[PDB]
């Protein structure tokens, strides 16, 4: 069961899931994520990079590293095996010397319209789902909508239409309309995760990329309590 990830985290006194664990968990709820695998060696990756498909992004996985980039724990646009051997040894090299679980091999995410899907716990209303457009639209303008879980289809659709930036989803200069049904589906499932898993205090799906067909969560945080 995916609950094993939460149980293991709790027994080890962790207050969050590691990146791959978070991706696995939300995937098990039917929310599409960037394809990932965990490498316990430089060679274990070749089957996985091959399987996943180049170019693959590499990320260090360690309870220690809250920020992956400052330590030098990230490597982007790796387009071949030789390029994995290099980006792999470099990240081992780098983080070790900065900080003495494995390497995450992650698929490339084609550009699209970025979204955020949140889950928080309100003192009065309990698990609550948050939606907004990515980038400046949430971070700078704070354009978000909320619905208390569980979400109906009516809740998901209306909370999407309610944000000021909504038109970024229905086609504009050099960008096709994106899959709104797939967004609604993910919102509802995010609410279900909150309702069902009491040990999840908070969850962040950020960034989520929406395409003309389907969506993909690129990064996800799950906070425990």
């Amino acid at each position: 069961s995916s609950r094993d990830l939460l149980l293991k985290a709790k027994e080890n006194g962790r207050k969050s899931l590691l990146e791959h664990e978070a991706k696995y968990f939300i995937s098990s709820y039917g929310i599409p994520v960037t394809n990932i695998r965990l490498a316990k060696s430089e060679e274990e990756a070749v089957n996985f990079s091959r399987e996943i498909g180049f170019p693959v992004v590499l990320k260090i996985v360690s309870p220690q590293v809250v920020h992956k980039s400052d330590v030098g724990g990230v490597k982007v646009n790796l387009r071949s095996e030789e390029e994995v051997r290099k980006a792999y040894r470099e990240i081992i090299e780098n983080v070790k010397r900065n900080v003495p679980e494995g390497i995450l091999v992650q698929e490339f995410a084609p550009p699209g319209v970025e979204l955020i899907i949140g889950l928080l716990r309100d003192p009065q209303f309990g698990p609550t789902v948050m939606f907004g457009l990515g980038g400046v639209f949430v971070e700078l303008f704070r354009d978000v909508s909320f619905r208390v879980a569980p979400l109906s289809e009516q809740d998901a659709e209306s909370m999407i239409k309610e944000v000021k930036a909504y038109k970024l989803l229905t086609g504009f200069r050099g960008m096709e309309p994106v899959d709104i049904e797939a967004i609604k589906d993910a919102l509802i499932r995010a609410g279900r995760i909150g309702v069902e898993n009491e040990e999840i205090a908070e969850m962040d799906l950020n960034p989520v990329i929406a395409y003309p067909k389907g969506i993909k969560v690129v990064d996800a945080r799950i906070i425990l309590r």
Partner: protein
Amino acid sequence: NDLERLFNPSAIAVVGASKDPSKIGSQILRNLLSYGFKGKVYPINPTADELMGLKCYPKVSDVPDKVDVAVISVPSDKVLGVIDDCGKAGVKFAVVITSGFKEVGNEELEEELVRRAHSYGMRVLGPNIFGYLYAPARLNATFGPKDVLSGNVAFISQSGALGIALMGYTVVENIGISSIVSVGNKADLDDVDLLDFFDKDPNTGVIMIYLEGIAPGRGRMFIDVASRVSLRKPIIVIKAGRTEVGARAAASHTGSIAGSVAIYESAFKQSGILMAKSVEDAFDWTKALSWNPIPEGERLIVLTNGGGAGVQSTDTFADNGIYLSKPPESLIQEIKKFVPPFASFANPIDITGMAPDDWYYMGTLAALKNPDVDALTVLYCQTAVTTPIGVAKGIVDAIKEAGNSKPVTVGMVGGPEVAEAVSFLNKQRIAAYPTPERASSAMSALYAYARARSYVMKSLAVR
């Protein structure tokens, strides 16, 4: 859990009534008798043999009867003892007028009050409240006004002074009341419990709530209950702390943490609740919702003897997402039988400033009788060609003779004669207002509720 015997008790005790007619307990007892309670009333006082002609007792447990409700009006340092005695007496509800609990920082005393009540299977209203009124039981257990107009509106207030003032204000605004409930600190019984009762109450058709907040962990149930109630009865919430700054301020008055503005709003939408930003808006909407059926379609007609009032109406509706469409040709033809050629039929229908009184009769009658008309807002600008009361009575006659019921609101502009005409209409339970924007906002509340109800229905759709 069942509040049937709170609102319709066989026996009520008033603990803390006194020979001194000025004390709160005595004021409550006086209202109970004045308003005409038909059950048994038991004044409770340590020394008095009788109060206001009724046999008095020193303890509720001395009463040779089963007391349903004890209204407690003794100081906070005496409340817990009374609670134990009421518990022993088997009392179901403790209506705790008394102040001096969580609202002044004595959170522990308040929690002990509830803990103690519950150990006897007893529920608590309040504390820190001005009581409650239930019209169908001729029950006025408040120290507020002695009387209210009878009707189908239940008003729940978390505020004290404003709540008791609003109780009086309902009379001036001609709002018929089924119940007034002061909930105050809301330490036990709350909005959810009350909504459950009013849901089943055939006497209550509209619920208005002055609300600051609800207790932690209570929100999910609030939405669950409120949404189902909204399927049949509109809920209007006057939210205290609508803004970030207001939310911070109101929270410290209640001795609580400030709730999320955005999430409350979302909860209200998911509940089908209408959020009012002001007393006037709440009362205006409550009036219309109390006295009208919900529109069954978008075919709203505006009738006016002037383009200007009509434009104010159009702008106001537009602000509420309501847009007018061309009237039915049948309606236009009917009205052309008496209207000048230079009248306008774009909707609003402008019957021009030359319109005498009976044109309001005929126009209103034609609109309401037309099968493709769902709602009517009637606008009147006083001229020398008309009498305001004449216009009002024409509207009344048209409504009666339409032999149906569609939502109607009326806006009349003018001097003292318009003021009296508006009053006349409202005392006939026809929602009337002294400006076209207020009449249009009132009708807008009817459509907002229809859409709110539709939101809830869609959200409950089966997969």
